[PDB]
Amino acid sequence: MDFLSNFLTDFVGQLQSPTLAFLIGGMVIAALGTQLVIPEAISTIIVFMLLTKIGLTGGMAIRNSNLTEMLLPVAFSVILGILIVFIARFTLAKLPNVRTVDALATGGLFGAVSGSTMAAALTTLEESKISYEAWAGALYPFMDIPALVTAIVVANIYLNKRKVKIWPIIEESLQGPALSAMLLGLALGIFTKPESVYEGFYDPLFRGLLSILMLIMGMEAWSRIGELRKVAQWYVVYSLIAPIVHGFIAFGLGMIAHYATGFSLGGVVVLAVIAASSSDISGPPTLRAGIPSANPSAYIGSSTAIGTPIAIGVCIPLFIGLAQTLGAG
């Protein structure tokens, strides 16, 4: 049976990792009233460089691996991203005081993927000596894009009925920053050979630049908290429980691919964590330009301030611990 004795030790290990320590450390200094600011120019280039590596590592892995082995987990990521958004449409969009336009916006971010949470799952898996598929990092675009597009399409359809086109929605969402960079990383990885520039400039300092960005998110997450208390009380209950619910559905779907194909038991952890994670880098900018009517405090503050720490501190130890007690680990 599952045990929580090692979960607390694993939970603390996530609490001390630079991905979450900097995010928490940013909250502490911002609460204390620090005047430190990271210039917007550096923040813009960090977002591009973090996702180019994600696109690159998802490109050199999709061309080096058999496509027939990675079609069912990819088909599950596409299904999962769409399913999570619709869950918020029938669960979060029906509480007493919750705007349906805001419920779809926050459902889209929770259905999308978090680069920091996904990068923390791969780091924690190898530190636990659990083997995972090398192309698990290529699942980022197959859950992010379908989740963002679904949120915009359903919300716009709901808005039209309250007094339709998908391609203009897709092309405007996908061509924006932080989403074209990942495709650029994808296109270069699949066709070209960026191994010389990926392992020398994009890989070694990817997690270094991530720590700076979590500090930016952590510092601003203090402002979102308290501003998130001015909308509704159901965006805190959802952001606390949805990552657990989304991950458990992902884990169940991962087992179907684990028995149908040779999907490793340590690879369903990535699929579970990739679904529990709520996007905070390429999600908010995409939903802001796709659903302008949505309050950009009930879906940015509910996925960055509460969405990411839970999916990175309570989900990763839970699913890795669940994989260890269920098989290889």
Partner: protein
């Protein structure tokens, strides 16, 4: 020595590529966009020969984005001294 109206549009940075489309389609002979803070933002500076042309850009932006986004637009009276795109081939 040519009268002009300085239309200033301060909005969010997400509208950088959308407001500029409205400005160019309105026949404005060049604009000026720059970064802006505040508790991030952008600042436009469109010089229009006549007020009716400045309000034409103003109306087409407020009724399209100001309902969902946050911004303020104001007009200042400025006198253009030299400019090739503004003061035709020979003027000012």
């Amino acid at each position: 020595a040519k009268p002009a109206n300085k239309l200033v549009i301060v909005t969010e940075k997400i509208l950088l590529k959308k407001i500029a489309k409205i400005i160019d389609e309105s026949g404005a002979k060049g604009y000026t966009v720059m970064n802006t803070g505040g508790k991030a933002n952008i600042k436009f500076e469109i010089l229009t020969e006549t007020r009716e042309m400045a309000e034409e850009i103003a109306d087409r932006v407020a009724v399209k984005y100001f309902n969902d986004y946050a911004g303020i637009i104001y007009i200042c009276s400025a006198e253009v001294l030299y400019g090739h795109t503004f003061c035709g081939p020979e003027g000012c």
